[PDB]
RNA sequence: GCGUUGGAUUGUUCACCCACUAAUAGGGAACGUGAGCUGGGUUUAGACCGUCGUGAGACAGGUUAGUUUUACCCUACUGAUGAAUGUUACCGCAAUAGUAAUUGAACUUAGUACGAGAGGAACAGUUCAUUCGGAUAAUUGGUUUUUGCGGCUGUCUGAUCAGGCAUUGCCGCGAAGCUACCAUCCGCUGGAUUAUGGCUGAACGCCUCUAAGUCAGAAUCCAUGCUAGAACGCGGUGAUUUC
RNA sequence: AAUGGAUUAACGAGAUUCCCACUGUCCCUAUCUA
RNA sequence: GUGAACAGCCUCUAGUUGAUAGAAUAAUGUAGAUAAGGGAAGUCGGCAAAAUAGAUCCGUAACUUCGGGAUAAGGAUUGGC
């Protein structure tokens, strides 16, 4: 079984999903789903399409180079099946993926910090440049307090 | 090709039912009634917790 | 003339009259007979069909070209809660047929099966079995006679069961009564068994196990009044034909001066009762068992319920049966699972299956992810998260 | 199956009916093939005999050497471009239709095969697989 | 007078599958029942004992 | 699915694609093969006047002069500037074979890049001298 | 019982090839089948060429152009309710009627029997396919008025925003649903016989397969199994209103 | 053989045959709207 | 206003808002569409549908009454700023 990625989508293709395409140069183009497949025929560019992962690794979004991401490459030399490798890899894959998420969430906070600065500078323009609307709300509070009275 | 209801194939199939494929059935019927006799033993011990 | 090109008939004459069935629960026509040396064992079971999924399997089949290779295939998942017993029925062989001569009920019934006897529950005084449980006084003895009568007479014994619909996400509140025959020997041993299971529930693995070839019967998928072409498979007349093109052209010859009974007219399609045999159980999971969908390979703690549940059906949290191919019927419908009717002979009835992966991606769209922890792992964090 | 084809042949999607022009994949000199009939086919009223991957069809040649044209000869289909089902969970399809030509014993006429050869066709016919440079 | 009339569920009270809700015909009939109950009060009859005993309809030109 | 997209993007009417065309420009031997094809009867310009960027044969040498001075051919020049998007770019996006990916990007930056630009410079040096 | 095809030349059946296939068997039902289709050809009026006639015109003849158009009626058939058997509800039995699966290759026996050679089989064990049928929607394709989400041209609301109209304006993706040998799954075994092979065995002091008796034996017949359930065929059980 | 015959550019809601392009006519049917 | 245009689609002045309506969305229809792979194997017969289509530049055969054939055929292109 092979969880191989979409050619266009970079999402996992579980066994039983998606179409394969084979070029006459004989390399295989496995596809996530029909949306990615019909967009491939039409000669698009996933550097340009915003929803795919090839855009997001290129356009300065979600982190691309990491020491945790080099653990799952491919192996063309088979490792002869010792069990005590297998018992640690089932503990390794639960450990690499946690450090992946603690770095990816921390990479998201570098990209979204200081929004509250621009959130508050946006509010100084709305409040201060509308003096006439702020008179209307003052009588709205006084009419609110008087109805309870 | 011989049909489904030919006399020769129904005789060859009758020999196989005397042999292996009934012993795999007769082993299955004993394993199943083991769990059915354990199913009362669970559901009486649930009744004994009401009696405490 | 002589028809000039012989061709097979369109449609099967065996499954006639094509008409709507008598009930949503399809009745069972015949059971596996009796082997009167065997232990007491139930012969059928009833549960609720819910959705489909995919299965990969390392095919261990001698002789095939897919020996020792992997094969993907589709199974059904039938929600199977435990089923509780409420009655015994005995039948006397006549020279006319079988005849029921006694039913015996069980001192206290669930509110699901007081609900079967009413069509207007909320106005009713709920008086279903009140005069019957006063006949369980000091010794009973109006029961023990009707037990002893079945022991003396009554060549075969059938046992009344019903489902537990309140344990199902299906919103219907009303259980289905059924009759199931027994196959343990010496009918005194049959009827002593069933008296020891009144008000007492039966599991599913006490009736089946893996690698078994069973058969499912139901009432299949209504479609209303359907024209001849999609009903029988008749060829379409070419284009712009007068009086239509989706029909049989010549319905009869000049003799006999009657439309015969075999010329494929239009009418009801669907909602017939059917029987499909030789369906093979792969997997019998447990309700209390967490990680039902995890095989020996996956080791990922996940249940067979796909993400966001099945489509038009909720969550599983009961016992289930995963049987390959496609059961006749649709989702949230009642199927009945008989067992095999005869000793099967092929090697396909004998194979020990070994599941390798169960799909649990969502059926409500082109689903890509298995667990909701995968989707958060792959997407990264989101705006509503922080 | 028939002559030459070792083993059995599973059900795949029928891509090429009668009268379907397909490319020629060997170095024999034919450019396109033209199917007239499919061997091992069924018989039903108003159907067309349809070919698939790894079949043997009787096929004529429309474009090629004048030594090869105007004679019916068997041919084995190696590419389909209609999506079929490998039994591991994937559908796949090729870019174009293609077929090599052979004697009824199943032995190749050319010496090489250009382009990728189908996997189900290469299992069924050994002499194709000896001349196949690329599998899948 | 009931050929080719569509069926309905509401005729189970009378045992007939074919029933219909004629609007214009009822408005004259309950116009006449309103007239007959006015005529019985003028003679000095009882209201609770009064029932329709004869009714008839036949063709006009 | 639609009407217009089926007419141009069937499996029968598929063009070459962007992957192979970057390989043809990348070396000096395959450029000289395609600029100097042997003449063939089954090809529109009788196997001459072939553009390498757009995998497309032209009828006449006049039809290369008017094709290069167009917004259609200035897509494919601007399209083939960077790394040609193999399968390896899509696998690196999921956290899978970075060192296979980053070494190829290292080679396109160092070696394959300026060999391609010194080939596309000579095509404009040649197609202006003959046209 | 089951199965008998795909094409090529004339309105054409008549007449005859090409290839596949296990095989391309023969017939009937108003030379089946126009109030099913077709009007291709059969039969008006228009027109030409050829023969005959002084002539109108007819033909030994050839070519072309060309109007019959219900069904809502009773029956038949495919489906659908339904009064009355004290009311009402649930669980059943089975009279009768229908009935379904089919053909080819492959591994092993075995390069063995058989053969001078060249060649070259069976049954048993086992795996897949060809037509046919019943369903089913995981997956993959097809479909989109979810007008769901975008995009484009023309005009219109002062511009932005958000939108109207373009007989669903058009383009891309599109869940759900419906669907396809364009997708996947499944398709049983007991009895009695026909040809024919036999045993005991006379007629006929031998002999015989038959006359009495009897053992086998066909895709055949009736059953098991599968569909409907007699709305005037039946059984078992639940409750049975005080205004 | 002005009962008119042979020839022929252009033109034709005239009659017939084929080739590329093209496509539910067809293999084989499916679906959506009024 | 778009456009070569009194074509087609949209709007201002002026004028109508009339044509039996309600509820459901079976078959078969009438009118209009889209289809994987193959591409006339359908059929008496390519009937019907699809494809081509405006404009600019290049290019254009036999044949002939020299006027035509000719938009012959076949190609490159078309937005916004």
Q: Is residue D2 one of the residues assigned to a domain?
A: no
To one decimal place, what's the resolution in Å? 3.5
CA distance A14 to A2: 7
Long-range contacts at C362-366 (CB < 8 A, ≥ 24 apart): C362/C306, C362/C307, C362/C308, C363/C51, C363/C52, C363/C53, C363/C306, C363/C310, C363/C311, C364/C308, C364/C311, C366/A17, C366/A33, C366/A34, C366/A35
Q: Do C212 and C359 belong to one domain?
A: yes
**Interface with chain F: mutation pick from D21, D81, D92, highest number of F CBs within 10 Å:** D81
The packing angle between helices C144-152 and C188-195, to 10°, is: 150
Helix axis angle, F18-25 to F113-127, nearest 10°: 80
Look at residue D38 and tell me if it is in a domain.
Answer: yes
Given C202, C234, C254, which residue is the final one in a domain? C202
Q: Would you give the distance in Å from CA D21 to the centre of its chain?
A: 12
Q: Does the CB of D17 sit below 7 A from strand H?
A: yes
Tell me the CA–C1' distance in angstroms for C243 and G47: 37
The answer on C100 and C68 residing in a single domain is no
Among candidate residues E43, A98, B23, A11, the one with its CA nearest the CA of residue C343: B23
**Chain D positions in Cβ-Cβ contact with residue A31 (cut-off 8 Å):** none
Say yes or no: C102 and C68 in one domain.
no
What is the DSSP track for A9-71? T--B--TT-SEEEE-TT--EEE-SSHHHHHHHHTT--TTT-TTSHHHHHHTT-S----SGGGG
C-alpha span between C343 and A99 (Å, rounded): 56
Q: What is the CATH number of the domain that holds C48?
A: 2.40.30.10
Tokens standing for C42? 């139930």
Backbone φ and ψ of C267, nearest 5°: 175, -145
What does the angle CA D119 – CA C57 – CA C374 come to, to the nearest 5 degrees?
Answer: 100
Question: What's the rounded Cα separation, in Å, for the pair C139 and F103?
Answer: 90
Instruction: Determine the longest span between alpha carbons in chain C, in angstroms.
Output: 83
C74 shares its domain with C112 = no
Is D92 within 8 Å of chain F by CB?
A: no
- What the block records as the tokens of F56 is 């497309």
* CB-CB neighbours of C122 under 10 Å: 6
Same-domain pairing of C129 and C173: yes
Looking only at the bridges linking them, the beta strands covering F50-51 and D32-38 are unpaired
Within-domain flag for C368 = yes
Strands C156-162, C177-181: pairing is antiparallel
Name the residue with tokens 């890049």: F113
Dihedral through CA D121, CA D125, CA D129, CA D131, nearest 10?
-110
Contact C85, C157 (CB under 8 A): no
Q: Provide the Cα torsion C100, C101, C107, C111; round to 10°.
A: 30
Beta-bridged to residue C214, according to DSSP, are C279
Contact F42 D96 (CB under 8 A): no
Specify if D4 maps to a domain: no
Burial degree of A54 (CB within 10 A; 0-12, 13-18, 19+)? buried
Closest CA to C271 of C335, C328, C233, C313: C328
- Name the CA dihedral angle for E35, E39, E42, E45, rounded to a multiple of 10 degrees: -120
Instruction: Report helix angle B20-51 to B7-18, nearest 10.
Output: 50
CATH number, domain at C138? 3.30.1430.10
Q: What's the Cα-to-Cα distance from C247 to each of A131, C225, C257, D80, F120, rounded to whole Å?
A: 77, 14, 20, 35, 65
Among residues E37, E60, E34, the alpha carbon closest in space to that of E50 is found at: E37
Side-chain half-sphere of F76: how many Cα atoms within 13 Å? 21
Provide the CA F117 to C1' H1 distance, Å, integer: 83
Q: Which one-letter DSSP state was computed for residue B30?
A: H
CB of A34 within 8 A of CB of A28? no
Helices (H), chain D: 119-124, 126-131
Closest CA to C289 of C300, C280, C302, C298: C302
Q: Sheet harboring D90-93: ordered strands across?
A: A28-30, A19-22, D90-93, D84-86
Give the residue among C371, C368, F14 at the shortest CA–CA distance from A6. C368
Distance from C-alpha of A48 to C-alpha of A58, rounded to nearest angstrom: 10
Q: Which nucleotides of H are covered by protein (CB under 7 A)?
A: 23, 25-31
With touching defined as 3 or more inter-chain CB pairs under 8 Å, the answer for chains B and C is: yes
Can the peptide bond before residue C17 be classed as cis, meaning omega within 30 degrees of 0? yes
**Interface residue C41 vs chain B (CB under 8 A):** yes
Q: What pairs with residue D58 in β-bridges?
A: D37, D74
Chosen from A2, A19, A23, A26 to mutate, greatest number of chain D CBs within 10 A:
A26
Q: Which helix (H) or strand (E) holds A104?
A: helix A83-111
Tell me, yes or no, whether C48 and C126 share the same domain: no
Task: Name the neighbours of B, counting chains with at least 3 Cβ pairs within 8 A.
Answer: C
**Residue among A100, D87, B50 at smallest CA distance from C381:** A100
8 Å CB contact of D45 and C7: yes
Among C202, C232, C261, where does a domain finish? C202
Domain membership flag for residue D5: no
Q: Across the interface, do C5 and D45 touch by the CB < 8 Å criterion?
A: yes
Measured distance CA(A3)–CA(F94) in Å, rounded = 11
| Cβ burial, residue C175 (10 Å; 0-12/13-18/19+) | buried
**Do C184 and C278 fall within a single domain?**
no
Structural domain containing residue D107: 15-136
Q: How far is C236 from chain D (nearest CA, A)?
A: 12
Per the structure, the count of domains in chain D is 1
C309 and C189 both lie in a single domain: no
**How many C-beta atoms lie closer than 10 Å to residue D79's C-beta?**
24
> With an 8 Å Cβ cutoff, is D82 touching chain A?
no
Q: Tell whether C1 is covered by a domain.
A: no
* C-alpha to C-alpha distance for C88 and C102, rounded to whole angstroms: 8
Nearest Cα of chain F lies from the Cα of D18 at a distance, in angstroms, of 18
DSSP run (H or E) holding C321: strand C319-324
Spatial CB neighbours of C196, under 8 Å, sequence gap ≥ 6 = B40
Kindly list the residues from chain B whose CB atom is less than 8 angstroms away from the CB atom of residue C202. Answer: 36, 39
For residues A12 and A72, the answer to whether their CB atoms sit within 8 Å is no
Strands C213-220 and C333-338 turn out to be antiparallel
Whether chains A and C touch (3+ CB pairs under 8 A) is answered by: yes
Q: What does each C-alpha distance from C11 to C15, C21, C26, C230 come to in angstroms?
A: 9, 19, 23, 11
Measured CA to CA, the distance from residue F20 to residue A93 in angstroms comes to 37
C236 Cβ contacts chain H strand, under 7 Å: yes
C283 Cβ contact list (under 8 Å, min separation 6): C75, C210, C320, C321, C322, C355, C358
Interface of C with B in 60-119 (CB under 8 A): none
Q: From the CA of C16, how many Å to the C1' of G182?
A: 30
- How would you classify the pairing of strands C83-93 and D21-24? unpaired
Q: Which nucleotide is nearest to D17 (CA to C1')?
A: I38
Buried b (16+ CB within 10 A) or exposed e, C215-240: bbbbbbeeeeebebbebbebeebeee
Q: Is residue D3 part of a domain?
A: no
Cβ within 8 Å of A, C 60-99: 70, 72
Round to whole Å and give the CA distance between C162 and C180.
10
Asked if residue C214 and residue C178 are part of one domain, the reply reads no
Probe site for chain D from F10, F11, F12, F19 (most D CB atoms < 10 A)? F11
Do residues C62 and C183 share a domain?
no
With residues binned 3-state (H G I as helix, E B as strand, rest as coil), the percentages for chain F, rounded to 5, are 55, 5, 45
Q: Is residue D125 part of a domain?
A: yes
Determine the distance from the C-alpha atom of residue B26 to the mean position of all C-alpha atoms in its chain, rounded to a whole number: 6
C66 plus C89 within the same structural domain: no
User: In total, how many domains does chain C have?
Assistant: 2
- Residue ranges in chain C assigned as alpha helix (H): 144-152, 188-195, 228-232, 372-379
Chain F residue with minimal CA distance to A56? F93
**DSSP, residue by residue, F1-30:** --SHHHHHSSSTT----HHHHHHHHSSSHH
CA distance D73 to D58: 6
Closest CA–CA distance from residue D87 to any residue of chain C (Å): 5
Q: Do chains E and F touch (3 or more CB pairs under 8 A)?
A: no
Q: Is D7 contained in some domain?
A: no
Phi-psi bin for C59: left (phi > 0), alpha (psi -120 to 50), beta?
beta
Contacts of C55 by beta carbon, 8 Å cutoff, 6+ apart: C72, C73, C74, C75, C282, C322, C324, C355, C357, C358, C359
**Residue D38 Cα, gap to closest chain C Cα (Å):** 21
**F11 to D96: CB separation less than 8 angstroms, yes or no:** yes
Q: In the Cβ-directed half-sphere of C79, how many Cα atoms lie within 13 Å?
A: 26
**D10 lies in a domain?**
no
Tell me the CATH number at D123. Answer: 2.40.150.20
Which structural domain, as residue segments, surrounds residue C349? 16-81+203-220+270-384
Look at the block and give the residue holding tokens 């990969």.
C56
What is the C-alpha separation between C137 and C140, in angstroms, rounded? 5
Nearest-CA residue relative to C1' of G174:
A35
* Chains linked to D by 3 or more Cβ pairs within 8 Å: A, C, F
Q: Distance (Å) from CA B12 to C1' G124?
A: 8
Structure token pair of residue E31: 């116009």
Q: Show the tokens assigned to D110.
A: 């050319």
Same domain for C41 and C111? no
Whether F11 has its CB under 8 Å from any CB of chain D: the answer is: yes
């Amino acid at each position: 079984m092979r969880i191989y990625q979409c050619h266009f989508c970079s999402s996992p293709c579980y066994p039983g999903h998606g179409i394969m395409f084979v070029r006459n140069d004989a390399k295989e183009f496995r596809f996530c789903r029909s949306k990615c497949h019909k967009a491939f025929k039409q000669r698009r560019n996933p550097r340009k399409l915003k929803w795919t992962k090839a855009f997001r690794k290129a356009a300065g979004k979600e982190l691309a180079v990491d020491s945790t991401l080099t653990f799952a490459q491919r192996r063309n030399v088979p490792v002869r099946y010792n069990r005590e490798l297998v018992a640690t890899t089932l503990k390794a894959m639960a450990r690499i993926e946690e450090i992946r998420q603690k770095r990816e969430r921390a990479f998201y906070k570098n990209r979204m910090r200081g929004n509250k600065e621009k959130d508050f500078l946006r509010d100084k323009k709305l409040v201060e440049s509308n003096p006439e609307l702020l008179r209307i709300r003052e009588v709205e509070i006084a009419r609110k307090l008087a109805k309870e009275q | 090709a011989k049909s489904l209801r030919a006399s020769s194939h129904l005789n060859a199939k009758s020999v196989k039912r005397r042999g292996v494929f009934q012993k795999a059935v007769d082993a299955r019927e004993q394993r199943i009634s083991d769990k059915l006799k354990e199913d009362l033993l669970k559901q009486k011990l649930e009744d004994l917790k009401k009696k405490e | 003339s002589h028809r000039k090109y012989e061709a097979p008939r369109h449609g099967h004459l065996g499954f006639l009259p094509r008409k709507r069935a008598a009930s949503i629960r399809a009745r069972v026509k015949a059971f596996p007979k009796d082997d009167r040396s065997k232990p007491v064992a139930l012969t059928s079971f009833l549960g609720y069909k819910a959705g489909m999924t995919t299965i990969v399997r390392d095919l261990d089949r001698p002789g095939s070209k897919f020996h020792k290779r992997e094969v993907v295939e589709a199974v059904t998942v039938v929600d199977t809660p435990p089923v509780v017993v409420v009655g015994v029925v005995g039948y006397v062989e006549t020279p006319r047929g079988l005849r029921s001569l006694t039913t015996v009920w069980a001192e206290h019934l669930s509110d699901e099966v007081k609900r079967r006897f009413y069509k207007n529950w909320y106005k009713s005084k709920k008086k279903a079995f009140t005069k019957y449980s006063a006949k369980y006084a000091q010794d009973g003895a109006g029961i023990e006679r009707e037990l002893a009568r079945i022991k003396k007479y009554a060549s075969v014994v059938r046992v009344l069961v019903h489902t537990q619909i309140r344990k199902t996400p299906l919103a219907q509140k009303k259980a289905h009564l059924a009759e199931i025959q027994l196959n343990g020997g010496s009918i005194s041993e049959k009827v002593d068994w069933a008296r020891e299971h009144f008000e007492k529930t039966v599991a599913v693995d006490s009736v089946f196990e893996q690698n078994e070839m069973i058969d499912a019967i139901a009432v299949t998928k209504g479609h209303g009044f359907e024209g001849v072409t999609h009903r029988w498979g008749t060829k379409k007349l070419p284009r712009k034909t007068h009086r239509g093109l989706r029909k049989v052209a010549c319905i009869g010859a000049w003799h006999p001066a009657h439309v015969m009974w075999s010329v494929a007219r239009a009418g009801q399609r669907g909602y017939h009762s059917r029987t499909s045999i030789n369906h093979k159980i792969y997997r019998v999971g447990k309700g209390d068992d967490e990680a039902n969908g995890a095989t020996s390979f996956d080791r990922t703690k996940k249940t067979i319920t796909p993400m966001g549940g099945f489509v038009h059906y909720g969550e599983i949290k009961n016992d289930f049966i995963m049987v390959k191919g496609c059961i006749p019927g649709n989702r949230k419908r009642i199927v009945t699972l008989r067992k095999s009717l005869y000793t099967n002979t092929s090697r396909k009835a004998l194979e020990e299956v070994s599941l390798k992966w169960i799909d649990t991606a969502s059926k409500f769209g082109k689903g890509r992810f298995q667990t909701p922890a995968e989707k958060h792992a792959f997407m990264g964090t989101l705006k509503k998260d922080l | 199956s028939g002559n030459g084809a070792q083993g059995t042949k599973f059900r795949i999607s029928l891509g090429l009916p009668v009268g379907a022009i397909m490319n020629c994949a060997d170095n024999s000199g034919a450019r396109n093939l033209y199917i007239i009939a499919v061997k091992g086919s069924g018989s039903r009223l108003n159907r067309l005999p349809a070919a698939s991957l790894g079949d043997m069809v009787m096929a004529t040649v429309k474009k090629g050497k004048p030594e090869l044209r105007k004679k019916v000869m068997p041919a084995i289909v190696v590419r389909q471009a209609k999506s079929w089902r490998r039994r591991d969970g994937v559908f796949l399809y090729f870019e174009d239709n293609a077929g090599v030509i052979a004697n009824p014993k199943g032995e190749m006429k050319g010496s090489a095969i250009t382009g990728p050869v189908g996997k189900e066709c290469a299992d069924l016919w050994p002499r194709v697989a000896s001349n196949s440079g690329v599998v899948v | 007078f009931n050929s080719s009339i569509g069926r309905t569920a509401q005729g189970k009270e009378f045992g007939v599958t074919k029933a219909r809700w004629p609007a214009k015909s009822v408005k004259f009939v309950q116009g006449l029942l309103q007239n007959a109950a006015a005529n019985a009060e003028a003679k000095g009859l009882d209201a609770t004992k009064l029932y329709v005993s004869h009714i008839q309809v036949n063709q006009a030109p | 699915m639609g009407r217009y997209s089926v007419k141009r993007y069937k499996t029968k009417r598929r063009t070459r694609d962007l992957d192979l065309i970057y390989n043809d420009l990348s070396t000096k031997e395959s450029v000289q093969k395609l600029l100097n094809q042997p003449l063939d009867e089954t090809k529109p310009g009788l196997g001459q006047h072939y553009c390498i960027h757009c995998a497309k044969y032209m009828e006449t040498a006049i039809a290369l002069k008017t094709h290069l001075k167009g917004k259609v051919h200035k897509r494919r020049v601007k399209e083939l500037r960077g790394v040609p998007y193999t399968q390896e770019v899509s696998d690196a996006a999921a956290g899978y074979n970075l060192n296979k990916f980053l070494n190829r990007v290292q080679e396109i930056t160092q070696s394959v890049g300026p060999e391609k630009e010194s080939n596309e410079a000579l095509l404009k040096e040649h197609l202006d001298s003959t046209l």
